[PDB]
Amino acid sequence: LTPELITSLQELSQILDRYDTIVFDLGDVLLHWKGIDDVRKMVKHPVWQDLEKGLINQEFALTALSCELETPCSKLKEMLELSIASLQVNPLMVEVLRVLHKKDKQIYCLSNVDLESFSYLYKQFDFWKYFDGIYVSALLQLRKPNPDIFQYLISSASINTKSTIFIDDKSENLQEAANFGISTLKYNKDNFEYTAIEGGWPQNMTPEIHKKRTLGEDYLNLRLRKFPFCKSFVSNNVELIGGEDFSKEIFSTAVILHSYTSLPDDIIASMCHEILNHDGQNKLRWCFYKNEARPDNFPDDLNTTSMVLSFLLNHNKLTIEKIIPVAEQMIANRNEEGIIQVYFDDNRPRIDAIVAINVLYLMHQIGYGERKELKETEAFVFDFLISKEYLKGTRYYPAPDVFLFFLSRLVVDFPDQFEKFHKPLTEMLITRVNCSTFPLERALRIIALKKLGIVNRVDFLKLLDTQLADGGWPVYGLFIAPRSNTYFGSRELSTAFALEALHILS
Amino acid sequence: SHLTPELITSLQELSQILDRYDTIVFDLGDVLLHWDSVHFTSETKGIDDVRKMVKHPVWQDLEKGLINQEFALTALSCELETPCSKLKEMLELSIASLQVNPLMVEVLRVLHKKDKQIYCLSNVDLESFSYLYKQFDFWKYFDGIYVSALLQLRKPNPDIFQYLISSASINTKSTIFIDDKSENLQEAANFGISTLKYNKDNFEYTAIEGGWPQNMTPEIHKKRTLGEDYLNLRLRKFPFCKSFVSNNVELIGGEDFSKEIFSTAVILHSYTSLPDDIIASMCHEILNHDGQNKLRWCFYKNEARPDNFPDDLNTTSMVLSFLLNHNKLTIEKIIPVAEQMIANRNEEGIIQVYFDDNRPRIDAIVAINVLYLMHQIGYGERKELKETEAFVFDFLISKEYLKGTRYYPAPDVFLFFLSRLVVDFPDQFEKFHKPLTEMLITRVNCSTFPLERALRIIALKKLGIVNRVDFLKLLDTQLADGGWPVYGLFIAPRSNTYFGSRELSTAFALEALHILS
Ligand SMILES: CC(C)=CCC/C(C)=C/CC/C(C)=C/COP(=O)(O)OP(=O)(O)O
Ligand SMILES: CC(C)=CCC/C(C)=C/CC/C(C)=C\COP(=O)(O)OP(=O)(O)O
Ligand SMILES: CC1=CC[C@H]2C(C)(C)CCC[C@]2(C)[C@H]1COP(=O)(O)O
Ligand SMILES: CC1=CC[C@H]2C(C)(C)CCC[C@]2(C)[C@H]1COP(=O)(O)O
Ligand SMILES: [Ca+2]
Ligand SMILES: [Ca+2]
Ligand SMILES: [Cl-]
Ligand SMILES: [Cl-]
Ligand SMILES: [Cl-]
Ligand SMILES: [Cl-]
């Protein structure tokens, strides 16, 4: 066909408004800017593709290019970083972005950025909030102009090829996008090349993925149907190697109900029954143990309580009227720095950032969101993130991704009261993509990032591998009794989170 | 309409049937081995039959090397509701009751005496396979061993059969399969392979005409050609193999050095499929080297030779060994240099690394490469070699190779070079075989560095075992230009300076892909 050179902003505004979904490229669209003096030679080398698909980090790609390009490793690095910093926002396109966002459009970002750079550009600029989904190559292990990434974007976002227009400066990228029935709009610094394209007619793993998802579902269903009081094993390592059956704590049952939403109704009913008949429930405060295992003077905790109450309220098993009293006791549990503490016992003073997150969640869920007493507790969690002190884990949660996950719930479900948490949190999660092997830690990152509007397909892929032949994933130690260093876990907890990660990316 | 198999009972006929076939495939368990499954331990709680552990699906993940026993047990600990420590006892008692089946192991020996083609196809977790290779002694009768843990493939998946036929170039017309599991026999029969079911007091023979006609090969031929092109282009532009230096095996932040001749020799010695023009081009660099005094080589070029840095034996051994094997030097000229090396022993009789009494030092790998030259020139029987050979042997038996050598920190490097010696002079190194081979088995897919993967792929293949796992994951780490990432093969221990090159890594990688094709 033949493009339609556009030079009138009025024409552009009318052309864009004819589409429900707009897809932006990053380079030259939204952002413009010893040996080899041209960085163009690095980006044109085949090894750069391995960097864009996340297969290797910049450090790897640099040393590999030092050899191929016959340039000192230090120089290629200094030039690459200088190129990154010099990136500037394109004011025209950023405004075209904010506009299409206030007009309630579907706006996705499809760029070929390496993970480390994308993590930097996410912290540098602020137009990221205008996107509904972010599809970066380093998090997909795909890259333009391979048709795979386009098919994945279409099926991932449920995009309709018609009413969808793609903006990019590369002809090959637009060329491929058009083969799927997407209208193209090439960005030249002077003008635009508009090419309307008829769309409507309808990835490459739905056959394999649907099978593993079914297998995993069947496994977890059987377990919880046989043990609605979620089982738990105990050891001294996060892998629960040589662990012994315990199954005398109620928190695991909560976590499952609070995280995996696709549970069949009969399991949810049966598991909910356990959360109610729990003999550790005095009033509407819960104890971690059953009475049969309660170690004598072991008090009730705000973590099991915050979850059980938050869940029951969200499922119409309690009224805010019944809960606010309990919530007020928690307000009275503040330590000398104004931080809500973990136990209903002034003689067991202990604080935990994740416990504070689940308490703060209940507060904002019941209307307590703006109580002046939560100030210190909220700042405690914010500093725990900003100071990167979450890498040392919480008192009872040693895995850093656990804190980021539960924080993402509070930040996504109450965005008005936690807007300053968004970008700092998403930066951390991006830098931690594929940084561990335990499937549960992967599922967490997969879920949290998606809720934050970023698709993490790397951890998703390597999650499918760690599934065992009976559908379930390996046991994992989610929380610990610190003084004795005792991990609690179960294959249910792991399979639950893994299944949700699969569902949230379907 | 169902086929009816000949009921064979006379062992006279059993050898009549088997004699008609060129290739025979044995299953390990219940054919060559048997064992007791039930063990009522001091628990009583839960499972009593190990048959239920092998019956569970999680066992498939163990058989395919995806998990180890400790992992598979803590999982079955939950599924079977049996304490972790009890399932471990049961498995150990089961393994300990393992015994040969004398009837079948004799069938194996006879078929090997008649110079048949015999292969072993069995599902065995990696840790158990390492154990069986040490416990029993019929492995010598196999022309090639295909174990699930070494393949990431298990029976009766048709894939594993298709891989066996492809890897071994098996002509299924004259091939028979001995197994007890009826479903493993059915799948083989659908490949044109005649079956023979092993029962108690009864063989079931079923002739299979066959004739009716792997699947990762297209991806493999492409990646092999790409790596070939990358290496030939690099070596043709720099026949003196370049090298980088840094503080880590990763060679991250590596500065160009390319003033050492060892990399050049290692590639000539290790990559067999090098194009001829490069072999000559690189060979010239070795002969016309700066630090070539007499017939003793120096690691550095004279421009980079530190003050009073002497000639070393590791370079001289390899260079001479290569020049001899390529008919570019006569044994008559090398034996005088070999005598200098025998005159280079320390208080304990171990051949030292340097031609310099002021720089005494020893290295098990350098000893290995020296002993290879000795046995290659007729010195194999010399008295003065005893202490040096034992030094290498204790290094292997004491599992001290796991801490690396003075100049080679990667253990797989020690095993690889020792496998050249053990395999190329078998009559002089029989006691090295089973220990060396079992060690390599326990290290399958134990590290991710491409070069280390190739070393295990090559060594295990020369020792008769096909390592497909490392083979697959080797194709992953291949960068988009064909070549593999850099890798630091040896070090300057005083300053902890690693040497390596993308040429080195790619060279071994291509060899490993070549040797399993
Ligand atoms: C759900 C959840 C993580 C709640 C927070 C606290 C809690 C009840 C955790 C579960 C396991 C446990 C008994 C920890 C305290 O051990 P300790 O015996 O070391 O007690 P201390 O350190 O608090 O005294
Ligand atoms: C692979 C090979 C050729 C091994 C034999 C010796 C050798 C020349 C190794 C390469 C690195 C080097 C030049 C010196 C290391 O010894 P140092 O300089 O660290 O001090 P040392 O010589 O006292 O150990
Ligand atoms: C092609 C290119 C060059 C350098 C590259 C870096 C500066 C190294 C990182 C940000 C991303 C980018 C600008 C990228 C754009 O990606 P695309 O917009 O083309 O997908
Ligand atoms: C699958 C299996 C069961 C138990 C197993 C052990 C006793 C644990 C170890 C030796 C090997 C073996 C007999 C093996 C035989 O392999 P197969 O002949 O069945 O393929
Ligand atoms: Ca671009
Ligand atoms: Ca069998
Ligand atoms: Cl009550
Ligand atoms: Cl505390
Ligand atoms: Cl804490
Ligand atoms: Cl025996």
Ligand SMILES: [Cl-]
């Ligand atoms: Cl030494």
Ligand SMILES: [Cl-]
């Ligand atoms: Cl040593």
